[PDB]
Design an enzyme around this catalytic site. Structure first.
Site, PDB file in Angstrom:
ATOM      1  N   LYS A  59     -23.146  22.754 -24.725  1.00 24.41           N
ATOM      2  CA  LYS A  59     -24.235  23.543 -24.028  1.00 24.41           C
ATOM      3  C   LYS A  59     -24.274  23.889 -22.561  1.00 24.41           C
ATOM      4  O   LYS A  59     -25.173  24.623 -22.215  1.00 24.41           O
ATOM      5  CB  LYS A  59     -25.278  22.250 -24.675  1.00 24.41           C
ATOM      6  CG  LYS A  59     -25.869  22.184 -25.737  1.00 24.41           C
ATOM      7  CD  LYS A  59     -25.241  23.694 -26.840  1.00 24.41           C
ATOM      8  CE  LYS A  59     -25.877  22.906 -28.610  1.00 24.41           C
ATOM      9  NZ  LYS A  59     -24.183  21.997 -28.825  1.00 24.41           N
ATOM     10  N   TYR A 274     -25.989  16.968 -42.047  1.00 25.36           N
ATOM     11  CA  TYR A 274     -26.106  17.315 -40.974  1.00 25.36           C
ATOM     12  C   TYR A 274     -26.421  15.815 -39.981  1.00 25.36           C
ATOM     13  O   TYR A 274     -27.060  14.796 -40.454  1.00 25.36           O
ATOM     14  CB  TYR A 274     -27.949  18.007 -39.908  1.00 25.36           C
ATOM     15  CG  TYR A 274     -27.772  17.632 -38.421  1.00 25.36           C
ATOM     16  CD1 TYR A 274     -26.688  19.097 -37.847  1.00 25.36           C
ATOM     17  CD2 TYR A 274     -28.538  16.932 -38.080  1.00 25.36           C
ATOM     18  CE1 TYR A 274     -27.606  18.517 -36.613  1.00 25.36           C
ATOM     19  CE2 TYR A 274     -28.526  16.666 -36.520  1.00 25.36           C
ATOM     20  CZ  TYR A 274     -27.819  17.766 -35.968  1.00 25.36           C
ATOM     21  OH  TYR A 274     -27.792  17.636 -34.786  1.00 25.36           O
ATOM     22  N   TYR A 300     -20.641  16.188 -34.226  1.00 21.62           N
ATOM     23  CA  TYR A 300     -20.051  17.645 -34.126  1.00 21.62           C
ATOM     24  C   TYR A 300     -18.919  17.617 -34.168  1.00 21.62           C
ATOM     25  O   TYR A 300     -17.859  17.851 -35.031  1.00 21.62           O
ATOM     26  CB  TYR A 300     -21.390  17.979 -32.895  1.00 21.62           C
ATOM     27  CG  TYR A 300     -22.380  18.151 -33.769  1.00 21.62           C
ATOM     28  CD1 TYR A 300     -22.580  19.360 -34.189  1.00 21.62           C
ATOM     29  CD2 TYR A 300     -23.561  17.221 -32.646  1.00 21.62           C
ATOM     30  CE1 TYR A 300     -23.998  19.705 -33.979  1.00 21.62           C
ATOM     31  CE2 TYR A 300     -24.468  17.579 -33.142  1.00 21.62           C
ATOM     32  CZ  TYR A 300     -24.974  18.910 -33.049  1.00 21.62           C
ATOM     33  OH  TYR A 300     -26.384  19.343 -32.971  1.00 21.62           O
TER      34      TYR A 300
END
Lengths: 343, 333
Positions: A59, A274, A300
């Site tokens: 990010k 998730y 992730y």
């Protein structure tokens, strides 16, 4: 190299404002112990966990372009959102702090398991230390984009000029950061005389994969790219990656159209949903830590690596092939999952 | 360099960045503060100990060692980085932890560097009471291991041996090349000083190259005189090992121990303030045991008028951010 055109992406990228928020280029390293243990291709790791921004992450690359855009628009406050243990939220707060800007945050209660450390340690602790203003913690299933637009509208009413960053930073502007990563990888592989046969990484809000495929296709690089989904099934994830990639392609002013077949997702490693690791996710964490001293994360990058490991074990790759796994970060989240690791 | 003669493994991401801190500098209104980002070495969240391990484990490999032994406090960053670096080499790490701090509850005992230690596969043999002779405890463990056929390499606390100190002799050279490259006059270097290897290596390197950059260590535990004595001794021994002629000037070793507070692992109010200011002005994570005390010293010395506005101070971020999670109970207060 045929008609490969390294730098054509960089040329289009040069016209966009970009702030310096991370340590680039990040290293490209061989994983010799993992490679030997699995018995197949040689595995290299692109270390985008090592961007330097409050323990780092993918990010950080997006934020260099997003926050430059915000400055160009005269924004005086940043709004973004993520799940409780979002890495994106933490990196946005830290980067905006460097610019003297506050970040207003909506968190989503996507995971209710794992107890107090999930609610209070990991990225939540860092969010607070870095001075984030967590406005609300919203029920799972909330349209988080609409909630942010309602908050932005309220803030404009008070005279502020907010800049709204979508979940994961995955707008066309944010995706520019991984166009630049593709050019970085092409240059490094050239300097190392390394032929890259596949690029694999965890894919979620889609900006990472969209930027990479844009940069690879814009340079006519014949490197296959495979996204390992962390949540959405294959078709929905591929459609969203492709839609964002074509918007990024258009934003850059690249003529024509991106090949749809360049967008590939494998959703076999999502597990129950998730932020819920499988046994294979946890195995991937243990192997990388104990063979390579590398810290993955259970949301992730651990699922991305579990995918790569499983595909190698199934014989998909030759021993003379070279795979680049993008380490997208996430290790701060480890401390949010302490209760699961203790069992 | 005299350093090319010594074995060195690649375990981190060097050179680390040398960055200006423009918001902190403007906030305090004094000198220009730069940060040497030795938190960003890349080894399992990073740290200064990574530099030392490149020389220590190369030595262990040349000696044919087949297991690594080291020790630290419960939340030791050195232990965590040693296990990770040894694991990169295919070696296991046997660990003795010392209960130097017994506050801050479950998160201090189980989160932070302890969680990382366990994830990384470290073999934590025991958790020994504070004041235990940890070097001796390690020697006993090693001798017992040799009886089982092992060839252990014992790394002292903080990796602060002359071999380990070579890592920060290398950092000094790195720093001089960077300042030459950036056309940056470095008026003072400041960092948190504990087991002494970081300060000793930097001192040896700056003196060997006749650089004339003053260096101040902010102690994290020991009083000024004791710390200066130990830093000087290790720096002299490192000076010997590099075979550089003569002796190290005693005036080169300076320690300030006004920022220790109540003791090792107990932050002061100034420490917490330093943590808040760096995070919210610069997006930088310090730690409540080490780098936060070093920065608290720097901030206080600036507030007391020790530096002119046209001076350039280099603060070495030595790492430690993984320990923040061990101190969650303190931050919740």
């Amino acid at each position: 190299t045929g008609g490969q055109q390294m730098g054509r992406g960089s040329m289009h990228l040069a016209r966009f404002p970009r702030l310096s928020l991370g340590h680039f280029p990040t290293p490209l390293e061989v994983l010799p112990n993992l490679s030997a243990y699995l018995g197949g291709p040689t595995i290299y790791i692109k270390r985008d966990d090592a961007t330097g921004l409050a323990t780092g992450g993918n990010k950080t690359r997006k934020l260099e372009f997003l926050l430059a855009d915000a400055q160009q628009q005269g924004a005086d406050v940043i709004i973004t959102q993520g799940a409780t243990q979002s890495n994106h939220v933490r990196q946005t707060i830290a980067a905006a702090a460097k610019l003297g800007l506050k970040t207003k945050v909506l968190l989503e209660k996507r995971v209710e398991d794992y107890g107090e450390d999930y609610q209070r340690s990991g990225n939540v602790l860092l969010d607070n230390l870095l001075g984030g203003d967590i406005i609300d913690h919203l029920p799972a299933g909330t349209d988080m984009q609409q909630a942010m637009e309602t908050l932005a509208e309220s803030l404009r009413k008070e005279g502020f000029k907010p800049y709204v960053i979508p979940g994961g930073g995955s707008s066309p502007v944010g995706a520019l950061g991984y166009v630049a990563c593709a050019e970085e990888l092409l240059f490094q592989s050239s300097q190392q005389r390394l032929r890259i046969d596949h690029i694999v990484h965890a894919t979620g809000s889609t900006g990472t994969q969209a930027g990479l495929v844009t940069g690879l296709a814009a340079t006519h690089s014949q490197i296959p790219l495979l996204g390992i989904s962390v949540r959405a099934p294959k078709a929905k994830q591929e459609e969203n990656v492709y839609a964002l990639a074509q918007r990024t392609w258009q934003l850059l002013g690249i003529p024509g159209e991106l090949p749809r077949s360049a967008v590939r997702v494998n959703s076999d490693y999502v597990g129950k949903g998730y932020g819920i690791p499988t046994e294979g996710t946890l195995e991937a964490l243990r192997l990388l830590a104990q063979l390579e001293g590398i810290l993955l994360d259970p949301v992730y990058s651990g699922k991305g690596m579990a995918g790569l490991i499983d595909l190698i074990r199934q014989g998909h790759f030759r021993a003379d092939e070279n795979i680049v796994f993008i380490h997208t970060g996430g290790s701060a989240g480890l401390f949010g999952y302490r209760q699961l690791f203790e069992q």
